[PDB]
Amino acid sequence: GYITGDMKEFANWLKDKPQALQFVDWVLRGISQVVFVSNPISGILILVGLLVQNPWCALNGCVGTVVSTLTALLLSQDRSAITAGLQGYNATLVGILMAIYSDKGNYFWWLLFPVSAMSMTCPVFSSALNSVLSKWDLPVFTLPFNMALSMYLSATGHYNPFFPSTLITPVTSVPNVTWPDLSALQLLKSLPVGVGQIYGCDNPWTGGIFLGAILLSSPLMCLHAAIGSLLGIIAGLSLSAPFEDIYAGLWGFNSSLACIAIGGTFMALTWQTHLLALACALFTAYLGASMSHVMAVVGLPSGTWPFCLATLLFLLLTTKNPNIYKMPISKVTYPEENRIFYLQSR
Amino acid sequence: GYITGDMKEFANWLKDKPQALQFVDWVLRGISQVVFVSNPISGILILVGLLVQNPWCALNGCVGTVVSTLTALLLSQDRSAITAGLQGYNATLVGILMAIYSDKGNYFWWLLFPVSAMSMTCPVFSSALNSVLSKWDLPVFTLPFNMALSMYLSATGHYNPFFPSTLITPVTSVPNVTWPDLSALQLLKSLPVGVGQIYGCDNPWTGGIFLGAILLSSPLMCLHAAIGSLLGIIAGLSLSAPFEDIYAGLWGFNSSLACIAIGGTFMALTWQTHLLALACALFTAYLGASMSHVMAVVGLPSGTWPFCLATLLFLLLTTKNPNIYKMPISKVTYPEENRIFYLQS
Amino acid sequence: GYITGDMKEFANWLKDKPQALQFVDWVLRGISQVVFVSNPISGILILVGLLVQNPWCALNGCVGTVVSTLTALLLSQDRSAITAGLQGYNATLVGILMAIYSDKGNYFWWLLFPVSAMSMTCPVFSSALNSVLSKWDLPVFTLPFNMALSMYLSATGHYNPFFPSTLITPVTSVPNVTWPDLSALQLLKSLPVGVGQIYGCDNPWTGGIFLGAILLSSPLMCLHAAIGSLLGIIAGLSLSAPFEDIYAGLWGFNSSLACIAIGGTFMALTWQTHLLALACALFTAYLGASMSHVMAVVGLPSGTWPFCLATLLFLLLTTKNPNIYKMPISKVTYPEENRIFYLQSR
């Protein structure tokens, strides 16, 4: 009732309340915005899921969210966007993945310094990218996160004396894939792990929690999150990816995100638009593969660049099919509410 | 007369006729669009040239063209662009080059699955790139092809168990070049081989057939294709490229395309604009070496990125000289008819 | 008196007199535009600093400037920009760094051929980039130079039989940094060396001279040049860079340029923009590291790519703070005159 979707009522209720609680609320919506959700309860559930995988990653994610939100305020960015959590989600990722990609492991306190630095960067990236992309009425997605992360990880690299990153190298031989060995149960677990990997978690229970957090806000978003993850697995098997990479959900997170995006969030949901989302989800998985190989040559991970590039690409697609409709950015909420706008005008 | 230029007489006639015949027309015009030509007789001639070199590559080219054109229809893309062949050329290249860059050799039938998949992305890449580039009134050129190709070849790579690509590695030592062995005859043959390479064909006869196919539509385009190829050869020599790379036309195809593009087609042909096409063709050959080196590090070929980036760069150049005029995209056809618009505007 | 700032009085006097002096004026203003200065006395002084470092680089710089200026005239480019020197500074850099990155050493006379050819591409690169960037009211900065150089050095490479470039390879082990060895004297020298490295000069005297040339035109530009160089040093230390790299001013030149740009030149100088300039300079230094690692994998230097991208990113940041004001391109002079324009309309 009051804890579904955008929580419009709880938003209007807080407006008159203390600054501290209002701040905590924006942070939690910042966390949920990683999956296009603006819901503080979803934020709590996600944070819980993060504490379940790795309490270290949760801390860095939270520090990241706090610093960026505070930086957006220092730099007088738009209040609507802040309250909606749009100034926190990129730095939520910056903090988690910097911890994930650190060769120094859990509770390396020194990590907090470059996390804050890089989190402060996110409002700057967001603003700049917005100046360009809003001219086509495109969102920034997690481009701020991916630029910050690629920048940070290549500046340090595996051989930095203070902050070595994990070593990543290109493929240099044909992997042996034993097809009889392929487990049905393991593919099924890959689905929630693909979703877990959105926040860089490889735990199946965590991904289930994220699925639930999403479901609280929008069942349609939850559905596409799942399907996107599945399609990533399918693409993985089609190029003969090592099973262990599929099981770890590394083929599923970009696809999961792209599918949510196209499947009713940034395009109004119709059957044609649902087919479009599957296509985009597949395409993203294959671009994930491409970017992973190419970037490994420079010791970088692909991050969510593949999601950003493919999704932006599909949103710049135009058609003379009236059933394929791009939402105005200023009207973008969740699929259920988005669809009502489509039925009234198209 | 009827079989020259844009063939707009035959197109008007075909409009009333059966669906399947119209479709063959669009497919054939898609094939000729690789060299900016919208002519089904040129499409046929080019296809013959292809079937001559390697029927396997020819087949993949056609499957791409078909699948793309069908995807364009399925996704309600502009009709006129489809009928002009603008929705088939990128995938013609996707199919041919996916064959060239496969480590599996001829008639590896499975290759048809990814060729089809990648050919479906071509209308998507086209529309997305148009949404950006049309704001500066620029065409997308072969950017859809080059994106699709770089994506596919890097997602697979030389070490894919299913679809290995051919191994491509950077240069690791100074090539020994024996200058007395340089051959005028071989250099001269490198001219049509460079035009052949536009469709990934290293045969001088095939390249001759392509020049013939172009000439039928537009003598001026044919001339710039030849000139562009020549300038690429000059660029390779200027950089002491290994003779065999020059001989295989690898320095010629980007140059050739750039020279056609600037030399009458996207710029109105004047003596100034001709010099510009010469400059662009040189520049493009140089960028080709740059991109080939850099891309070899990640195991990719340069494709026709060089032509795409260089030509877009020269089209974005603004000048206060009235004799250097950029064609409005909606009024772009071939240099002979383009020049009439320029004189009458 | 008449030898500071634009020298708008002196240029108005030249508007009448012989073409060869007018041309020489443009070449000299072209040389100074490297550090955002349009002043021919500044140009002569910079030229002296180049001749002090290495006459061979100085020559190639000059061939660069002249050839590029001749080309912009041939291609009927805007004359206002030519007389201001905006058509010479990219090729000044092209000529100089082509000599620096040549593996053939001093007075390899054949080098003058591709220097001339790459200089001819500079106005082409400037115009096209202007076509795109002027839509957001942005300058091209040194993007023509950086495109020209990246293309040239990668088209040739270390293994080219005519024009081999110097060999650049990525980092492959953790360097050993002994902190007790850090030197105050060497660090102090790093500051002017950073400014010298804007023209690829590693001589502290040359960097001294360049500071003097800037000071002559705009003392506020001089201040930010020095601060930016210092912030790059601080960034280097913060990531435990090899001391010798910091001593060569390798961490200083990009951040120096960024600091001049934001700190009065393309943003009106206020307290707020001064701070923003310090942030942009730190940011630029870290991107320098990033771009250097990545571009070394393909055997290329970063050039001033980091400065170009960082500064453009900062010029695209919008805020609801009226103390942070972006200069209209048509209005940009030096910081002192810029601030006056701003205060009038504030």
Ligand SMILES: CCCCCCCCCCCCC/C=C\[C@@H](O)[C@H](CO)NC(=O)CCCCCCC
């Ligand atoms: C349109 C007009 C406006 C222009 C505005 C300019 C915007 C400036 C953007 C500056 C962002 C640079 C930081 C991002 C990544 C870098 O760390 C490096 C660059 O090699 N990335 C890497 O090493 C790898 C990243 C590669 C990802 C592929 C990107 C498609």
Ligand SMILES: CCCCCCCCCCCCC/C=C\[C@@H](O)[C@H](CO)NC(=O)CCCCCCC
């Ligand atoms: C302003 C709004 C527009 C936003 C639209 C976003 C468009 C994104 C395109 C996404 C598709 C990319 C596919 C092409 C190449 C990739 O596979 C990778 C990239 O790392 N290949 C490579 O590394 C090789 C590619 C190198 C070619 C040079 C690039 C100029």
Ligand SMILES: CCCCCCCCCCCCC/C=C\[C@@H](O)[C@H](CO)NC(=O)CCCCCCC
């Ligand atoms: C908005 C629509 C208008 C589109 C207009 C197209 C503009 C065409 C510009 C293309 C010229 C670029 C050539 C420069 C350098 C290259 O040779 C090499 C290889 O890619 N650089 C490198 O390997 C290093 C490059 C690293 C720098 C990162 C670039 C962001």
Ligand SMILES: CCCCCCCCO[C@@H]1O[C@H](CO)[C@@H](O)[C@H](O)[C@H]1O
């Ligand atoms: C504000 C400037 C921050 C830079 C200081 C970072 C200090 C790095 O910390 C160092 O890292 C070593 C290995 O990486 C560890 O063994 C030690 O904990 C520490 O000496």
Ligand SMILES: CCCCCCCCO[C@@H]1O[C@H](CO)[C@@H](O)[C@H](O)[C@H]1O
């Ligand atoms: C979603 C589509 C996935 C297709 C995966 C094909 C699985 C069978 O793969 C087959 O396995 C054999 C040995 O087990 C190999 O010798 C064959 O090369 C291979 O095609």
Ligand SMILES: CCCCCCCCO[C@@H]1O[C@H](CO)[C@@H](O)[C@H](O)[C@H]1O
């Ligand atoms: C859409 C999914 C396509 C899967 C097709 C996989 C094709 C596998 O191809 C296999 O390659 C082997 C080489 O290692 C050969 O020895 C086998 O004979 C061949 O069947």
Ligand SMILES: CCCCCCCCO[C@@H]1O[C@H](CO)[C@@H](O)[C@H](O)[C@H]1O
């Ligand atoms: C296209 C302009 C470049 C001219 C370079 C030509 C150098 C080739 O050299 C020529 O090759 C001939 C082979 O046909 C030989 O007969 C000649 O002996 C030889 O001089």
Ligand SMILES: CCCCCCCCO[C@@H]1O[C@H](CO)[C@@H](O)[C@H](O)[C@H]1O
């Ligand atoms: C535009 C006109 C195209 C010119 C085509 C010239 C083809 C010459 O081609 C040559 O043919 C010889 C046998 O005939 C072979 O021995 C050579 O290897 C081959 O290069």
Ligand SMILES: CCCCCCCCO[C@@H]1O[C@H](CO)[C@@H](O)[C@H](O)[C@H]1O
């Ligand atoms: C369009 C410009 C073409 C370039 C022609 C270069 C001619 C190469 O000339 C060769 O250079 C070598 C030194 O590099 C010498 O050792 C050889 O004796 C000489 O013949």
Ligand SMILES: CCCCCCCCO[C@@H]1O[C@H](CO)[C@@H](O)[C@H](O)[C@H]1O
């Ligand atoms: C535009 C074409 C320019 C051609 C430049 C030719 C450069 C000749 O390069 C020469 O090669 C010799 C043999 O390795 C070297 O010993 C010499 O140092 C070098 O000057």
Ligand SMILES: CCCCCCCCO[C@@H]1O[C@H](CO)[C@@H](O)[C@H](O)[C@H]1O
């Ligand atoms: C821009 C036009 C200038 C072209 C001058 C090129 C002439 C080549 O100059 C040669 O360079 C060699 C390498 O340093 C020297 O060994 C020779 O002394 C010199 O003749």
Ligand SMILES: CCCCCCCCO[C@@H]1O[C@H](CO)[C@@H](O)[C@H](O)[C@H]1O
């Ligand atoms: C801006 C960054 C702070 C600079 C750190 C200062 C470290 C200098 O260290 C000093 O170096 C001198 C050599 O010149 C030695 O004589 C001194 O003994 C030593 O303490």
Ligand SMILES: CCCCCCCCO[C@@H]1O[C@H](CO)[C@@H](O)[C@H](O)[C@H]1O
């Ligand atoms: C301006 C920021 C200065 C950065 C902190 C410099 C102090 C370096 O601290 C050093 O950490 C090293 C771990 O790699 C140890 O080997 C050294 O013994 C220790 O002194």
Ligand SMILES: OC[C@H]1O[C@@H](O)[C@H](O)[C@@H](O)[C@@H]1O
């Ligand atoms: O807060 C959790 C604690 O976990 C331990 O493993 C770390 O060593 C402590 O530094 C940390 O405070």
Ligand SMILES: OC[C@H]1O[C@@H](O)[C@H](O)[C@@H](O)[C@@H]1O
């Ligand atoms: O984890 C790295 C280091 O972080 C520092 O902030 C703490 O003082 C140390 O206890 C710890 O070893």
Ligand SMILES: OC[C@H]1O[C@@H](O)[C@H](O)[C@@H](O)[C@@H]1O
């Ligand atoms: O009333 C809804 C109307 O909206 C328009 O924007 C559509 O193009 C019409 O075809 C439609 O009937």
